[PDB]
């Protein structure tokens, strides 16, 4: 029907072509009758007749002459909705410049006429004059004029002289502004200057000057001359219940503009003096500016009472504009809403739906069914039948329900599992019965929740509800590989009580010929549900190629494990039920069933799990009592020993032996130790309290205490909650953030007294305030993420590359945190992984790594896999099917089409609620040493000291994988060496961080080069020891006579000649920095490893500051080019740093703020990506210095650290694709033979297809530079202005798109959700393939 939406400026001829009549009078309506005004705002001739095909006043009351317009009516003759499309125009007496092009920041008329905003407004509000082609006088064109400047000029240049003001003058300036001429000038000005600031100031002005010439937008279209009025139907005038009309705000705005315009026409008729018509035109200017965007000028106008009234731009922008309130989200027919309840008899593809809601939602299907049978005739009869609800429409209703799915939806839908399609089962009742397992997907408890039902009307929508959105199809969460139909709380208690054991029961050690008579012995009353027993089970192992082989054997098991074996499908082994089956074990039971036997046995087995869990939890009778919370007998003596310890510490505090901070630290330490001891006392007293004999002496076992099974099963409860119900509830913290030294020694079974409950209320009010304010940032994070993603659709099958990121296991310094099988599960390898022995093709180079491949990776102990990542995908406008990976909720690769940006954005932002808002190296294991980034030297004693700061100390095992990693500073005492074998727990590293070592490479004698006591260094003989040290001063304390003196130590031989560095001809002089203290004095012979000086010195907003890419306040500074380094100017704002490369060109430098403790010396050579100071590091520096793969590893590690600290499983594909959407823009460095500009920022796919269709020719391409935009700056900088207008500020984006003449080749998800068509991702990707093919 139509391609792209084009936006441009509105010419006065274009506004007269939209229009149907000039709106003169401001008179709205008659108000005493019902008729409007002829001819006012709500006219007849200008727009249309209120009534359909009627002259409002009187003629044509049938259907013959539609169109005639008599003189007595001055009325058109069409439809009732004809006025909604017709718009009027107000002939503004005095020109008024647009507020969107005068105050957009930056203003469109501000950087175009080369005039400051302040001066532009002055003249615009009749407060300053502006010259326009004066003539032969001493005045510029842009230069303004004041009353005094004009008065004198008026008497001076009375002849050829022009100096107007207001929009009129402004219009002229714009009108008489040779665009083309300015281009060359600006272009020549940019090529004839070197000023950095000017360059950017000139490139931003020429960009908007050449863009205006590229389109059909004129400079004189900025000023509004023929103001357009919105259709009445769109500014509706309806009365509320009563006798008055509740009028809209736009009618106030238009009525004021028309009142003022009529006054201004009458004053220009009457020839009023100058100051009267200046105030009149100024009031018209402010009235127009208030109509368009109210409140952007000084304080907004108001009708009733002090609240400002809502203008047109406030009908567009905001949370309640048209995008976010009526075009992205709509209210919807065939929909319903009610309170949910359980109904556990359901199968997990069906839900209960009440009869009253079912007869209301399915009224047209029932009408069609009733008309088909022949029971009635006309539609009315059917509506009377279902209004009466006779006895025959319920069979009609059960025949329209049967195979027709519905979309259930819980009201805060965060990820895609919050809309699932069921089949209805009709309910006597008024509450939606919802299958319990599905509740863990919706985050739906049953404490008063409500859900909405939606009906797929058409046939393609019924098939999408059955084939994509059915609840049997969503059994794996799309964020990872974990099953989302995990059995939640009652059913794991029923299983944990069923499959367990006790050391004596009915039927101990009897033998049973099958699981059927195991259940028969449980039901008849001859054995117990947990009584250990040899049974004969027949497990089917499918060891052949798709053939199930029976093996039958006698397992020593219990009765309950055989009864649960009657429900397990064929292929699973018996050892999946042989254990005790908590919650992690039943989750991996369903996961192994899904990986082996597929989907249909896993659906039917999930239902049979839920049924048998509910049934035996009912048979269990697992209550909770007051006696179940067993108080430790050792608890009171532990509290008295802690009270004796705080008594000892305070008796030392009365005598002043210890400090106050050490007292507070000792009290918090002994109460933490006593808390851990009380928790261990109660945990022994709960986990093994049952001690029952069997045929003789006693024997112990794990307890059948009720609260212990609710904790050990993982149903509801943890260690901390069961700790607070029996042991002491810790040391609660006051809202100051610091802890309180007197704990809450009473649990909940004993009574809390008053003060302890008040401290508890501190600790809990902080948590409720944190959740109720955290949810806003979590939701706004999901919004920013799905609007930066929004476009990215799997659109190929292979990009045809060999690049991809290097997935290693991540190791922080403790034991190996996340194994390689969690990171390289289901992601397609980049090059073929060599087997760790020698040069073998273990896996090929384009294989998906599912579980079988990952097990053959874990057997061979594969180091790290080079795997394909989304950020390395070469596909223009989308992601190919291999560089994404596995489907994650489907076992296979991602299909051609499935929108991965939206599921990724939802999977990152959905756990936003669970996240929070507000010496030396000791080895642990026993293995082999390896060093990386190492340049070292052996000292005199033997400990290998390091001459490199950035050395990584890895502990590699005997197999080949890397198990530990650490960072060792410059100059540390390593107890070990390279390639060595150590023992578990042996200290291998040592240093002093408070004393920066200035250790050497060679030996010799020490001379004090440029070290003079009195100006350079100072004499501070030590007080308490006597062994003095010449203390080196810094460059700020010494005066300007000797500030140029750099103290240093250079090593010589026994004669005095300079001992050179081994490898060069340069001596090894070390320039001493500020605040140093000389350790080894003059004449002392040195060696390696000996110092030459003493140098003394996060949750959810972290996720936001990583995706939005803020800078930290003190970033780590780096080096943009390798080579030698040196210092510069002495403290003029900053302290300089000059880097001269060995082979490369010199002139790069950087002025470091001198408040940082540096890392580099003067004789040190640096590299790109090498640190100069320490602290956090901004991602833009990673991108422009190290590489794209470096910054994607930086973001995925720095945000999986937050998601792992709070314990959420998210696969890394989602963070890699939001990282792709961050660094999608690029900047040009060398324009080459293309049509770009020098420092123009252009999107990367554009410049790559440009120089890839030019490089296939003879011409060599253009060399770009990638840039990392934060997510809101990157979604507002898009080549599709509806995508950047449905999101944040619409004023800025619509003026930028309007003055650029931008066009929206739709080509994404939200443009097609706005404009009302098929999404180009899902089922509609075939439709968009067809439409893109047929052009």
């Amino acid at each position: 029907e139509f391609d792209a939406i084009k936006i441009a400026l509105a010419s006065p001829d274009m506004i007269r072509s939209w229009s149907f009549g000039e709106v003169k009078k401001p008179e709205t309506i008659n108000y005493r009758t019902f008729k409007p005004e002829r001819d006012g705002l709500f006219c007849a001739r200008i727009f249309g007749p209120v009534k359909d095909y009627e002259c409002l006043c009187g003629k044509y009351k049938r259907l013959k002459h539609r169109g005639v317009i008599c003189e007595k009516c001055g009325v058109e003759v069409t439809q009732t909705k004809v006025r909604r499309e017709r718009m009027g125009h107000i002939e503004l007496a005095s020109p008024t410049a647009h507020i969107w092009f005068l105050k957009s920041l930056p203003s469109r008329i501000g950087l175009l006429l080369d005039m400051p905003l302040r001066d532009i407004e002055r003249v615009l509000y009749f407060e300053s004059y502006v010259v326009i082609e004066g003539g032969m006088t001493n005045l510029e064109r842009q230069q303004i004029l004041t009353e005094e400047q004009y008065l004198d000029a008026l008497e001076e240049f009375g002849d050829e002289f022009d100096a107007k003001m207001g929009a009129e003058a402004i219009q002229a300036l714009l009108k008489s502004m040779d665009l083309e001429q300015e281009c060359e000038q600006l272009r020549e000005e940019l090529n004839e200057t070197n000023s950095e600031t000017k360059r950017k100031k000139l490139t931003k002005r020429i960009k908007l000057l050449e863009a205006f010439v590229q389109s059909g937008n004129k400079p004189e279209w900025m000023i509004l001359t023929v103001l357009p009025v919105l259709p009445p139907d769109l500014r509706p005038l309806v009365p509320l219940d009563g006798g008055r009309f509740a009028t809209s705000d736009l009618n106030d705005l238009y009525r004021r503009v028309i009142n003022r315009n009529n006054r201004l026409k009458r004053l220009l008729d009457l020839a009023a003096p100058d100051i009267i018509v200046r105030n009149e035109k100024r009031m018209l200017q402010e009235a127009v500016d208030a109509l368009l965007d109210n409140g952007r000028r000084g304080r907004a106008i108001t009708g009733s009472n002090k609240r400002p009234l809502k203008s047109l731009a406030d009908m567009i922008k905001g949370k309640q504009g048209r995008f976010r309130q009526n075009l992205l989200g709509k209210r919807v027919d065939y929909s319903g809403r009610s309170v949910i309840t359980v109904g556990p008899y359901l199968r997990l593809h069906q839900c209960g739906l009440p009869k009253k809601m079912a007869l209301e939602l399915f009224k047209p299907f029932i009408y069609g069914k009733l008309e088909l049978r022949g029971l009635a005739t006309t539609i009315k009869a059917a509506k009377k039948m279902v209004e009466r609800e006779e006895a025959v429409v319920w069979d009609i209703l059960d025949e329209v329900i049967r195979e027709h799915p519905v979309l259930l939806n819980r009201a805060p839908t965060l990820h895609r599992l919050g809309i699932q399609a069921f089949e209805p089962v009709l309910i006597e009742g008024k509450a939606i019965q919802l299958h319990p397992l599905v509740c863990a997907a919706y985050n739906a408890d049953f404490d008063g929740d409500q859900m909405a039902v939606h009906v797929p009307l058409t046939l393609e929508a019924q098939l999408e509800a059955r084939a994509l959105m059915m609840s049997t199809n969503n059994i794996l969460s799309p964020a990872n590989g974990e099953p989302i139909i995990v059995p939640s709380q009652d059913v794991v208690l029923g299983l944990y009580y069923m499959t367990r054991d006790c050391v004596n029961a009915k039927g101990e050690g009897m033998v049973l010929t099958g699981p059927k008579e195991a259940e028969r012995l449980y039901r008849s009353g001859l054995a117990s549900l947990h009584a250990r027993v040899k049974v004969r089970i027949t497990e089917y192992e499918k060891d052949a190629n798709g053939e199930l082989v029976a093996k039958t054997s006698l397992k020593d098991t219990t009765v309950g494990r055989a009864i649960l074996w009657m429900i397990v499908p064929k292929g699973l082994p018996y050892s999946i039920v042989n254990q005790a089956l908590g919650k992690k074990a039943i989750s991996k039971m369903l996961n192994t069933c899904y990986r082996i036997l597929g989907l249909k046995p896993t659906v039917i087995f999930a239902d049979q799990i839920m049924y048998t869990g509910f049934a035996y939890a009912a048979r269990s009778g697992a209550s909770v009592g007051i006696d179940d919370m067993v108080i430790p007998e050792k608890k009171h003596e532990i509290i008295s020993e802690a009270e004796a310890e705080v008594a000892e510490i305070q008796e030392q505090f009365q005598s002043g032996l210890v400090t106050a901070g050490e007292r507070y630290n000792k009290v918090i330490d002994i109460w933490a130790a006593a808390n851990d001891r009380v928790s261990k006392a109660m945990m022994d007293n709960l986990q093994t309290e049952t001690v029952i004999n069997r045929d003789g002496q006693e024997e112990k076992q794990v307890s059948f205490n009720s609260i212990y099974m609710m904790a050990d099963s993982g149903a509801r409860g943890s260690a901390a909650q069961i700790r607070q119900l029996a042991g002491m509830r810790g040391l609660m913290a006051k809202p100051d953030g610091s802890i309180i030294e007197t704990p809450i020694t009473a649990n909940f079974r004993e009574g809390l007294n008053v003060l302890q409950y008040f401290i508890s209320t501190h600790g809990a009010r902080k948590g409720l305030a944190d959740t109720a304010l955290k949810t806003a940032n979590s939701g706004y994070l999901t919004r920013r993420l799905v609007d930066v993603a929004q476009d990215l659709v799997v659109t190929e099958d292979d990009c045809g590359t060999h690049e991809g990121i290097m997935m290693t296991p991540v190791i922080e310094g403790g034991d190996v945190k996340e194994p390689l099988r969690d990171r390289v599960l289901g992601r397609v390898t980049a090059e073929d992984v060599l087997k760790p022995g020698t040069a073998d093709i273990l896996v090929p180079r384009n294989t998906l790594l599912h579980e079988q491949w990952c097990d053959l990776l874990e057997e061979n102990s594969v180091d790290a896999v080079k795997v394909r990542s989304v950020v390395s995908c070469d596909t223009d406008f989308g992601v190919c099917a291999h560089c994404y990976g596995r489907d994650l909720a489907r076992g296979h690769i991602i299909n051609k089409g499935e929108a991965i940006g939206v599921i990724a954005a939802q999977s990152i932002g959905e756990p936003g609620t669970q996240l929070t808002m507000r010496s030396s190296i000791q080895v642990k294991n026993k293995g082999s040493i390896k060093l990386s980034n190492v340049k070292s030297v052996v000292n005199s004693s033997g400990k290998l000291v390091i001459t490199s700061r950035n050395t990584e100390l890895k502990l590699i095992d005997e197999f080949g994988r890397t198990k530990e990693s650490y960072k060792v500073p410059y100059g540390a005492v390593l107890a070990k060496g390279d390639g060595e074998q150590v023992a578990g727990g042996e200290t291998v590293a040592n240093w002093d961080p408070h004393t920066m070592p200035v250790i050497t490479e060679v030996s010799g004698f020490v001379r004090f080069t440029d070290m003079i006591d009195g100006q350079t260094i100072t004499r501070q003989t030590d007080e308490l020891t006597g062994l003095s040290s010449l203390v080196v001063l810094d460059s700020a304390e010494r005066t300007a006579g000797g500030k140029d003196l750099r103290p240093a130590l250079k090593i010589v031989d026994a004669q005095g000649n300079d001992v050179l560095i081994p490898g060069t001809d340069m001596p090894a002089q070390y320039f001493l920095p500020g605040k140093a203290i000389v350790q080894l004095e003059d004449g002392v012979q040195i060696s390696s490893g000996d110092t030459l000086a003493r140098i003394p010195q996060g949750g959810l907003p972290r996720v936001a500051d990583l995706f939005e890419a803020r800078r930290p306040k003190e970033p780590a500074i780096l080096a943009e080019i390798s080579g030698i380094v040196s210092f510069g100017k002495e403290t003029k704002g900053k302290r300089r740093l000059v880097i001269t490369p060995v082979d490369g060109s010199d002139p790069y430098e950087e002025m470091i703020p001198k408040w940082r403790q540096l890392n580099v010396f003067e004789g040190e050579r640096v590299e790109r990506g090498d640190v100069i100071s320490d602290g956090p590091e901004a991602p833009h520096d990673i991108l422009r210095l190290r590489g794209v793969h470096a910054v994607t590893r930086y973001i995925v590690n720095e945000v999986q650290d937050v998601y792992r600290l709070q314990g959420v499983k998210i696969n890394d594909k989602h963070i890699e694709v939001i990282v792709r959407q961050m660094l999608r823009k690029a900047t040009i460095v060398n324009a080459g033979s293309s049509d770009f500009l020098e420092g123009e920022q252009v999107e990367y796919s554009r410049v790559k297809i440009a120089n890839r269709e030019l490089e296939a020719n003879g011409k060599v391409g253009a060399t770009y530079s990638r840039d990392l935009l934060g997510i809101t700056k990157a979604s507002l900088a898009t080549e599709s202005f509806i995508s950047a207008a449905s999101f944040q500020e619409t004023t800025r984006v619509l003026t930028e798109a309007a003055v650029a003449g931008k066009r929206d080749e739709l080509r994404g998800l939200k443009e097609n959700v706005i404009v009302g068509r098929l999404i180009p991702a899902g089922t509609g990707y075939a439709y968009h393939q067809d439409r893109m093919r047929r052009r």
């Binding site: 441009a8 895609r416 619509l1294 509609g1324």
Partner: protein, 103 residues
């Protein structure tokens, strides 16, 4: 039975062609923004297309759909939403010339 509510077809608002909101007004459910993102997350392109064009806003689409349902033909004739043409007239009522291009 103060929370149970359902709507097939009834009255709508004035300015927009979408259904009214609430229970005291016999109105339908606001299919908000995150539900649209959840349908985009699946492949529900046709479910979303009737969810924002036929069931909600487009007047020719919904009258043709009601007649198509009661004839026994589950098929939608979509058209363009009315609130987007309301957007075009509110943007166009500024000094902005927004259009709809070639066939």
């Amino acid at each position: 039975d103060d929370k149970m509510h359902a709507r097939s077809t009834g009255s709508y608002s004035l300015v927009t062609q979408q259904p009214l909101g609430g229970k005291a007004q016999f109105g339908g459910q606001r299919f908000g923004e995150m539900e649209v993102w959840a349908l985009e997350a699946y492949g529900a392109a046709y479910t979303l297309q009737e969810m924002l064009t036929v069931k909600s806003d487009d007047v020719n689409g919904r009258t043709k759909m009601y007649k198509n349902i009661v004839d026994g033909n589950h098929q939608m004739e979509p058209g363009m939403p009315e609130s987007f043409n309301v957007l075009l007239k509110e943007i166009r009522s500024l000094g902005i010339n927004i259009e709809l291009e070639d066939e």
